[PDB]
């Protein structure tokens, strides 16, 4: 068939794009997630509760690698996340087939956010319902970026997205400083996800990925139980 | 609230084809008369301002050397149909080396008149008269926004249409002459227009079997006015 | 490799008269050194006042005839009258030029009556140029027939000879004799001579036998 | 491809998007033009200066060729793309037929561009009117205007924009034969006309004359100060 | 009513109203009557005019040497299908070198007109074709409709005030399969005098007759050659 | 047929025709034809009912809109 | 039962309405109403009354005692073509 | 309301009404039944005589898709023969690509996906037709499928579509079609469509029968005249 070819996102008489405002409400009703960079690498952490004991928790993953050195989490709705992951997987490849170099983390956010802006203006589509947190260690210095369904992006030291994010950002303000190691950042990222979790935080209720100068990787549930031990 | 542009009435006709018939009741009136001696064809100009140049506007325009025209309703979209009629007579001359007849000009325009839609956007709000002399003698045709054309003998088109058509059925007979058919039409235009009739409010054009399409000008026109 | 053309022979002849037009052709179809058939005329009746002859590559002569017969119907359904003879010749000049860069290998002669009941002959090249003449001969034996009709019809190269216009009776035996001379020296000129005569009352036909080499 | 009929008929036979666009013209600034027998004179009013902006970027009198000037009213966004399409057409005429473009020819290009654009799919009509002024070959000065429906139309004097009915009613009681007697006397008609409009007391007017052989020549606000003195001085003594 | 705007939208009863409103357009045109014998097919039309000086709008058109049609509805849609009709007859004559059969022509029309009755923003064709022709199986009378549903029949009548013409044909169709062309036509002419007001009938300028015949090419008779057919009819009983 | 009982109806009536030129009516509208045809004959002064009186009664019950439409066919 | 339609007047409907609302007002003798009804194509009877009541006010504007033909024409373009932004009709012909 | 205009909107309880409205147009078409015998399929269509003016053999509600496949329709006839064109065209591309005659489990699968594709978009409407497909093969036996306007297909030992659907398939299960050959079936097809449509609603009607099997050598064709006159001889014995 064909499409619609008209924007269903218009300006209000008060001058506010209403569908982008409603899409942020879907982001705020998502699972909580925190992300902290500290002086040698970035820690991404999320919160993954299965609805019942029947689910296989080792089947899908929130924390996803994009390349050797770039990871990515979200806080929003599920199926919209897997679309722009596969889009971001490809955009790192057309950069590499031209320049023969891994893409910088700043240039990836230039191109993922330009998709979402192009997607909130074109005809016959509703915008995405996810926000992102993107980490990576390009040229020594680590990076931590956050996009939104509107298409903007920022450069955070530490932030929180999802439910109770206004309580998470006040908690990080009284805890984070400029001088921490990576494993110190892990202990304060589980401590801030404990502010809104359920009663038991086991080795499969959360999912943590880290960056180093050695590259991005995702923690296996063995040592996640070790970090969850000696906590609070 | 909003229909499409392509919707039938419950009475069954259409909406915007019927709306375009209402639009040609706002144009200037126009009268054409078919006579066996030739076709006379007149119009008013409806001069608005004294500062306006009078000869810049026109309603009579020619299609070929033997076919004239007369337009009413809107004017700006009439210039599209005139240009399609001019190209159509030249393609017929190019391939067949003859002159296209007056009837087959009209259906070439009338097939264009109903082609709006949402593929490949509104009907044309004009109404036309076609005076010409082909090999069957002098002819006179009248098309529609609906794409319907029919041969008339004396047709009056414009805002004063039904007032003139009543006064035109009483003066016409089949054995007129061209010198008095011209005089008969200016009596009708004198009754229906607003301002007084002079050599600037109106213009005429006739086509004869002998000579080609001829349009009057402000020297040979006012002898008919002073001898009305 | 695959060559798209072949020469099938054939010879056509038209003479414009004062109130008539005679179009004649042989009836032999043949390519190479063989014979396909001994009965395949070239007299095609377009209207009651126009006959066309088509010689050359026979696959193009079959196609071009059917293209023309469609467009005579499209004229009448759009103009409520039949085409005149001059209108056909102006039309077919555009059809032949429309394949300028892959041309028809067809020689065409249109004979018929005008609006005043006089003869008219239009001869074509395979690209689509034309003029109106009194007599033309096209095809394989065109180099043999054209000098003879300059002497007899055109009254050329003669002294103290009176100029009488060609009657219908003189033009019949003039056509019948000139194919007998052409059948002797040309290997392509065939066996039966189909003669089509266009008058103000219809189209008559006549078949004359020849030698059958 | 956005395919939707924007301009449709009304149930009484009007095109609403066309006559809504004629009200966008009816609140743009006033532009007045008359023609003399040897020098044409047109000039916009209501410059509305804020003394912190570049005075040349705000101009509304532009040239399509050496011989053809153009003024407009309405909204300026749609104006300068009609101009840039008209500059291309009057240039491609020279690659064809060798003479420069007659002033009547370029208005038929603009009006036919403006009409078919109230006919296409998914396009709102233009919201501008124009004044095209030029002295063609054989030195015949004449002018035209363009309705947003696309009806080109010649004139002897005209005025469009906000406050156009009062100025046109002023010119009919004022356009005599001897008002176009001298070249400096036709300018005294325009400056008297725009003063009978939205105020523009010598600080908001910008005339631009053309003497049938030059290009356009904007006089700076010193002769306009000189002309507005003597235009009031004749009114100072007669009444 | 919100179910009455587009061709796509079904009614809660299951009747698309935009098709049913195009049936009103064919009820506005003037009447025409077609009927057939064993060896002939005759269709008779009734012209209208606007003023007494304008000419009458013709309705019977020549499609091919053995096919003719009669229209009822808006004429611009009629020429849009008639140009499709001529085109499909002569290319089959171009390819197969034979006249295209009548029953196979109409199946192309039913597929042509069904497409805009299912898309979005596409009107139906408001037209009322009665078709008369020859297969190798003799005469055929067909009618179509804007609902793209064509009917095989032996006598029909469509247009304004056509129900009175159908009542005449039902009580006389036992005689149609025997008579020659002379009283076959003036059987059909007695149908058109039924569908008129009681003062004017058949004044040789508003009627047209078309015949396709077993040795006869399809021929249209107009307003001078009608006069041999039109004479010999009795006065209207009252 | 039921509501035409008390009216002076000439035997020129085909109820099978009249039921067939009235489609999409109901029992009120079919009753409404008989009263309107019984009043149009009172306009022309007739005493009996003819077939054309019913056909003019149908055009009043359908409530068509009259707009100058004779340019078809 | 009955479903009487009140349409807009055609032309002779309009000419008769002018003769009703202007039969009792001081007018110039030589004015023609048929010219006026051609200038109001789709106009209600309510507007035609307001044309006649407006053009009498123009006679009361300056000094005079009876209206002229141009006093009507100054009332036509004000009532019909200047109040045309409102017009009240064209979204009610479709009855929505 | 407003939830039932397009075919792209679910209801607030989760069903599409544009499909259900189009199903309602099927119960105004009359009746088309078809049962399969031991060694073949017999269709049957009772056909309304609307007026005397139509011709015997007009506007057949019983098509012929391939050499061995048959179709009997019930619905809006312009949409019926539109589906009959693409099904006839689908069987041609099977033979031109795969070399042999198309089987029925694939043929009714390809058509029903084409019908299903018009119940997804706002740009098109659903079809207003239900129909049946029947055939016979020497390597497969007889087949009998049926397709609703939604796009759902199943197999049957006998089915019915039209106005009186339940009132027709009440008597079908009284038969024993597992053992009867397609000769006694033809008398029993015509009998069960005589007890339906009382003479109050319809004045007169027309029998139309179809027939396929190895007795027809696998080809689909109409019954001969003499056999259906025996079934119309078997007509007026249902009054006892």
From Swiss-Prot, chain A:
It comes from the Eukaryota. Keywords: Acetylation, Cytoplasm, Nucleus, Phosphoprotein, Proteasome. The modification Phosphotyrosine is found at residues 4, 22, 74, 119. Phosphorylated on tyrosine residues; which may be important for nuclear import. It is found in: Cytoplasm; Nucleus. GO terms for cellular component: cytoplasm; cytosol; extracellular exosome; extracellular region; ficolin-1-rich granule lumen; nucleoplasm; nucleus; P-body. The modification Phosphoserine is found at residues 5, 12, 14. It holds the Pfam family Proteasome_A_N. Induction: Down-regulated by antioxidants BO-653 and probucol. Down-regulated in response to enterovirus 71 (EV71) infection (at protein level). GO terms for biological process: proteasome-mediated ubiquitin-dependent protein catabolic process; response to virus. Belongs to the peptidase T1A family. This is Proteasome subunit alpha type-2. It comes from Homo sapiens. The gene is PSMA2.
Curated annotation (Swiss-Prot), chain E:
GO terms for molecular function: lipopolysaccharide binding. Gene3D superfamilies: Glutamine Phosphoribosylpyrophosphate, subunit 1, domain 1 (3.60.20.10). There is a cross-link at residues 112, 205 (Glycyl lysine isopeptide (Lys-Gly) (interchain with G-Cter in ubiquitin)). The keyword Nucleus applies. The keyword Nucleotide-binding does not apply. It is found in: Cytoplasm; Nucleus. It comes from the Eukaryota. The modification Phosphoserine is found at residues 107, 174. One of its GO terms (cellular component) is nucleus. Induction: Induced in breast cancer tissue (at protein level). Up-regulated in liver tumor tissues. Glycans are attached at residue 107. Keywords: Acetylation, Cytoplasm, Glycoprotein, Immunity, Isopeptide bond, Nucleus, Phosphoprotein, Proteasome, Ubl conjugation. Pfam families: Proteasome, Proteasome_A_N. GO terms for biological process: immune system process; negative regulation of inflammatory response to antigenic stimulus; proteasome-mediated ubiquitin-dependent protein catabolic process. The 26S proteasome consists of a 20S proteasome core and two 19S regulatory subunits. The 20S proteasome core is a barrel-shaped complex made of 28 subunits that are arranged in four stacked rings. The two outer rings are each formed by seven alpha subunits, and the two inner rings are formed by seven beta subunits. The proteolytic activity is exerted by three beta-subunits PSMB5, PSMB6 and PSMB7. Interacts with NOTCH3. Interacts with ZFAND1. Belongs to the peptidase T1A family. This is Proteasome subunit alpha type-1. The lineage of its organism: Eukaryota, Metazoa, Chordata, Craniata, Vertebrata.
Curated annotation (Swiss-Prot), chain F:
The gene is PSMC3. Belongs to the AAA ATPase family. It is linked to Deafness, cataract, impaired intellectual development, and polyneuropathy: An autosomal recessive disease characterized by early onset of deafness, cataract, severe developmental delay, and severely impaired intellectual development. Patients later develop polyneuropathy of the lower extremities, associated with depigmentation of the hair in that area. Component of the 19S proteasome regulatory particle complex. The 26S proteasome consists of a 20S core particle (CP) and two 19S regulatory subunits (RP). The regulatory particle is made of a lid composed of 9 subunits, a base containing 6 ATPases including PSMC3 and few additional components. Interacts with PAAF1. (Microbial infection) Interacts with HIV-1 Tat. It is found in: Cytoplasm; Nucleus. The modification Phosphoserine is found at residue 10. Disulfide bonds: none annotated. Sumoylated by UBE2I in response to MEKK1-mediated stimuli. This is 26S proteasome regulatory subunit 6A. Signal peptide: none annotated. The chain holds residues 367 to 439 of 439 of the full protein. Transmembrane segments: none annotated.
UniProtKB/Swiss-Prot annotation, chain H:
It is found in: Cytoplasm; Nucleus. Its main location: cytoplasm. Keywords: Acetylation, Cytoplasm, Host-virus interaction, Nucleus, Phosphoprotein, Proteasome. One of its GO terms (biological process) is proteasome-mediated ubiquitin-dependent protein catabolic process. The modification N6-acetyllysine is found at residues 52, 201, 225. InterPro entries: Ntn_hydrolases_N, Proteasome_alpha, Proteasome_alpha-type, Proteasome_asu_N, Proteasome_sua/b. GO terms for molecular function: ubiquitin protein ligase binding. Coiled coil: none annotated. The keyword Metal-binding does not apply. CDD domains: proteasome_alpha_type_3. The modification Phosphoserine is found at residue 238. Induction: Down-regulated by antioxidants BO-653 and probucol. Up-regulated by bacterial lipopolysaccharides (LPS) and TNF. GO terms for cellular component: cytoplasm; cytosol; extracellular exosome; nucleoplasm; nucleus; proteasome complex; proteasome core complex; proteasome core complex, alpha-subunit complex. Belongs to the peptidase T1A family. The 26S proteasome consists of a 20S proteasome core and two 19S regulatory subunits. The 20S proteasome core is a barrel-shaped complex made of 28 subunits that are arranged in four stacked rings. The two outer rings are each formed by seven alpha subunits, and the two inner rings are formed by seven beta subunits. The proteolytic activity is exerted by three beta-subunits PSMB5, PSMB6 and PSMB7. Interacts with AURKB. Interacts with CDKN1A. Interacts with MDM2 and RB1. Interacts with the C-terminus of TBXA2R isoform 2. Interacts with DNAJB2. PANTHER family: PROTEASOME SUBUNIT ALPHA/BETA (PTHR11599). The gene is PSMA3.
């Amino acid at each position: 068939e064909r499409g619609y070819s008209f924007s269903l996102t218009t300006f209000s008489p008060s001058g506010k794009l209403v569908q982008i405002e409603y899409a942020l409400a879907a982001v705020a009703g998502g699972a909580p997630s925190v992300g902290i960079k500290a002086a040698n690498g970035v820690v991404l952490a999320t919160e993954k509760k299965q609805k019942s004991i029947l689910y296989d928790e080792r089947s899908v993953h929130k924390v996803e690698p994009i390349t050797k050195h770039i990871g990515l989490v979200y806080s929003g709705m599920g199926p919209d996340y897997r679309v722009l992951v596969h889009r971001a997987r490809k955009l790192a490849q057309q950069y590499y087939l031209v320049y023969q170099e891994p893409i910088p983390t700043a240039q990836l956010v230039q191109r993922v956010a330009s998709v979402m802006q192009e997607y909130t203006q074109s005809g016959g589509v509703r915008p995405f319902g996810v926000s992102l947190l993107i980490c990576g260690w390009n040229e020594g210095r680590p990076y931590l970026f956050q996009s939104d369904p509107s298409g903007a992006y920022f450069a955070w030291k530490a932030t929180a997205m999802g439910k109770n994010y206004v309580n998470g950002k006040t908690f990080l303000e009284k805890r984070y400083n400029e001088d921490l190691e990576l494993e110190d950042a892990i202990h304060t990222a589980i401590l801030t996800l404990k502010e809104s979790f359920e009663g038991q935080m086991t080795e499969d209720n959360i999912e943590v990925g880290i960056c180093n100068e050695a590259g991005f990787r995702r923690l296996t549930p063995t040592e996640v139980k070790d970090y969850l031990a000696a906590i609070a | 609230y909003d229909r499409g542009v392509n919707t039938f009435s419950p009475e069954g006709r259409l909406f915007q084809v019927e709306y375009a018939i209402e639009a040609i009741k706002l144009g200037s009136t126009a009268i054409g008369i078919q006579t066996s001696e030739g076709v006379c064809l007149a119009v008013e100009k409806r001069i608005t301002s004294p500062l306006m140049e009078p000869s810049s506007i026109e309603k009579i325009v020619e299609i070929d050397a033997h076919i004239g025209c007369a337009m009413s309703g809107l004017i700006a979209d009439a210039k599209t149909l005139i240009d399609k009629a001019r190209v159509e007579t030249q393609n017929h001359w190019f391939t067949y080396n003859e002159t296209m007849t007056v009837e087959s000009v009209t259906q070439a325009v009338s097939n264009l008149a109903l082609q709006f839609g949402e593929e490949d956007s509104r009907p044309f709000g004009v109404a036309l008269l076609f005076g010409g002399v082909d090999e069957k003698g002098p002819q006179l045709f009248h098309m529609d926004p609906s794409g319907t054309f029919v041969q008339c003998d004396a047709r009056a088109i414009g805002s004063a249409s039904e007032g003139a058509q009543s006064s035109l059925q009483e003066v016409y007979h089949k054995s007129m002459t061209l010198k008095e058919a011209i005089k008969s039409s200016l009596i009708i235009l004198k009754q229906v227009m607003e301002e007084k009739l002079n050599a600037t409010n109106i213009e005429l054009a006739t086509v004869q079997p002998g000579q080609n399409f001829h349009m009057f000008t402000k020297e040979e026109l006012e002898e008919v006015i002073k001898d009305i | 490799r695959f060559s798209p053309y072949v020469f099938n022979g054939g010879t056509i002849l038209a003479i414009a008269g004062e109130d008539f037009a005679i179009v004649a052709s042989d009836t032999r179809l043949s390519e190479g050194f063989s014979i396909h058939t001994r009965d395949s005329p070239k007299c095609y009746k377009l209207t009651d006042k126009t006959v066309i002859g088509c010689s050359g590559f026979h696959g193009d002569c079959l196609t071009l005839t059917k293209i023309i017969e469609a467009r005579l119907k499209m004229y009448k359904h759009s103009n409520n009258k039949a085409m005149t003879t001059g209108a056909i010749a102006a039309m077919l000049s555009t059809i032949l030029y429309s394949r300028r860069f892959f041309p028809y290998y067809v020689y065409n002669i249109i004979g018929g009556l005008d609006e005043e009941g006089k003869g008219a002959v239009y001869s074509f090249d395979p690209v689509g140029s034309y003029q109106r003449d009194s007599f033309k001969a096209g095809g394989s034996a065109s180099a043999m027939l054209q000098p003879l009709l300059d002497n007899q019809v055109g009254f050329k190269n003669m002294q103290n000879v009176e100029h009488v216009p060609l009657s219908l009776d003189r033009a019949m035996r003039l056509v019948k004799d000139v194919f007998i001379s052409a059948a002797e020296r040309d290997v392509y000129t065939g066996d039966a001579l189909r003669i089509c005569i266009v008058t103000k009352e219809g189209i008559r036909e006549e078949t004359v036998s020849l030698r059958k080499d | 491809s956005y395919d939707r009929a924007i301009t449709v008929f009304s149930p009484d036979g009007h095109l609403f998007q066309v006559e809504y666009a004629q009200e966008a013209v009816k609140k743009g600034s006033t532009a007045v033009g008359v023609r003399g027998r040897d020098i044409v004179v047109l000039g916009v009013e209501k410059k509305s200066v804020a003394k912190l902006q570049d005075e040349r970027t705000v101009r509304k009198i532009c040239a399509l060729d050496d011989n053809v000037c153009m003024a407009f009213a309405g909204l300026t966004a749609d104006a300068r793309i009609v101009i840039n399409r008209a500059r291309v057409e009057c240039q491609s005429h020279r690659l064809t037929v060798e003479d420069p473009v007659t002033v009547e020819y370029i208005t038929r290009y603009i009006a036919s561009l403006k009409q078919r654009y109230t006919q296409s799919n998914g396009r709102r009509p233009f919201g501008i009117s124009a004044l095209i002024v030029g002295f063609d070959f054989d030195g015949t000065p004449r002018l035209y205007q363009t309705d947003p429906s696309g009806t080109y139309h010649a004139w002897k004097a005209n005025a469009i924009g906000r406050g156009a009915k009062s100025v046109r009613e002023f010119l009919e009681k004022n356009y005599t034969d001897e008002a176009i007697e001298t070249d400096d006397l036709t300018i005294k008609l325009v400056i008297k006309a725009l003063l009978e409009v939205v105020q523009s007391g010598g600080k908001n007017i910008e005339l631009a004359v053309m003497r049938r052989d030059q290009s356009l020549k904007i006089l700076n606000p010193e002769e306009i100060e000189k002309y507005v003195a003597e235009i009031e001085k004749e009114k100072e003594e007669n009444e | 009513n919100q179910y009455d705007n587009d061709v796509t939208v079904w009614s809660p009863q299951g009747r698309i109203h935009q098709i049913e409103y195009a049936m009103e357009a064919v009820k506005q045109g003037s009447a025409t009557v077609g009927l057939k014998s064993k060896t002939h097919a005759v269709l008779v039309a009734l012209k209208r005019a606007q003023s007494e000086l304008a000419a009458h709008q013709k309705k019977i058109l020549h499609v091919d040497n053995h096919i003719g049609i009669s229209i009822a509805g808006l004429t611009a849609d009629a020429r849009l299908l008639c140009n499709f009709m001529r085109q499909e007859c002569l290319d089959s004559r171009f390819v197969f070198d034979r006249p295209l059969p009548v029953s196979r022509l109409v199946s192309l029309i039913g597929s042509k007109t069904q497409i805009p009755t299912q898309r979005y923003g596409r009107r139906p064709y408001g037209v009322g074709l009665l078709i008369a022709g020859y297969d190798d199986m003799g005469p055929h009378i067909f009618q179509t409709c804007p609902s793209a549903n064509y009917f095989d029949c032996r006598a029909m009548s469509i247009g304004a005030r056509s129900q009175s013409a159908r009542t005449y044909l039902e009580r006389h169709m036992s005689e149609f399969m025997e008579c020659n062309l002379n009283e076959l036509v003036k059987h059909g002419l007695r149908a058109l005098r039924e569908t008129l007001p009681a003062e004017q009938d058949l004044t040789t300028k508003n009627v047209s007759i078309g015949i396709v015949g077993k040795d006869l090419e399809f021929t249209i008779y107009d307003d001078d050659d009608v006069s041999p057919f039109l004479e010999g009819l009795e006065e209207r009983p009252q | 047929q039921i509501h035409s009982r008390k009216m002076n109806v000439s035997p020129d009536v085909n109820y099978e025709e009249l039921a067939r030129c009235t489609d999409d009516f109901n029992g009120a509208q079919c009753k409404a034809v008989c009263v309107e045809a019984g009043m149009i004959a009172l306009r022309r002064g007739a005493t009996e009912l003819t077939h054309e009186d019913y056909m003019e009664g149908i055009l009043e019950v359908q409530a068509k809109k009259k707009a100058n439409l004779q340019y078809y066919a | 039962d009955r479903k009487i339609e009140f349409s807009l007047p055609d032309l002779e409907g309009r000419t008769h309405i002018f003769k009703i609302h202007a039969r009792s007002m001081s007018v110039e003798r030589d004015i023609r109403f048929e010219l006026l009804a051609r200038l109001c194509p789709n106009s209600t009877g309510a507007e035609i009354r307001s044309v006649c009541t407006e053009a009498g006010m123009f006679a009361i504007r300056a000094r005079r005692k009876i209206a002229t033909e141009k006093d009507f024409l100054e009332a036509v373009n004000k009532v019909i073509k200047s109040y045309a932004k409102f017009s009240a009709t064209p979204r009610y012909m479709t009855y929505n | 309301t407003g939830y039932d205009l397009s075919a792209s909107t679910f209801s607030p309880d989760g069903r599409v009404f544009q499909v259900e409205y189009a199903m309602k147009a099927v119960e105004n078409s009359s009746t088309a039944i078809g049962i399969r015998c031991k060694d073949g399929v017999v269709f049957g269509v009772e056909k309304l005589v609307l007026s005397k003016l139509y011709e015997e053999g007009s506007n057949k509600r019983l098509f012929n898709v391939d050499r061995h496949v048959g179709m009997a329709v019930a619905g809006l006839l312009a949409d019926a023969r539109s589906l009959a064109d693409i099904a006839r065209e689908e069987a041609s591309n099977f033979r031109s690509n795969f070399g042999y005659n198309i089987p029925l489990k694939h043929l009714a699968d390809r058509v029903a996906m084409y019908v299903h594709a018009y119940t997804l978009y706002s740009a098109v409407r659903p079809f207003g037709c239900s129909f049946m497909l029947g055939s016979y093969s020497v390597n497969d036996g007889a087949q009998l499928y049926m397709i609703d306007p939604s796009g759902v297909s199943y197999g049957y030992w006998g089915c019915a579509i039209g106005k009186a659907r339940q009132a027709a398939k009440t008597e079908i299960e009284k038969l024993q079609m597992k053992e009867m050959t397609c000769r006694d079936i033809v008398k029993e097809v015509a009998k069960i469509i005589y007890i339906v449509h009382d003479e109050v609603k319809d004045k007169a009607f027309e029998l139309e029968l179809s027939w396929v099997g190895e007795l027809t050598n696998g080809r689909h064709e109409i019954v001969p005249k003499d056999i259906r006159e025996e079934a119309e001889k078997y007509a007026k014995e249902s009054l006892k």
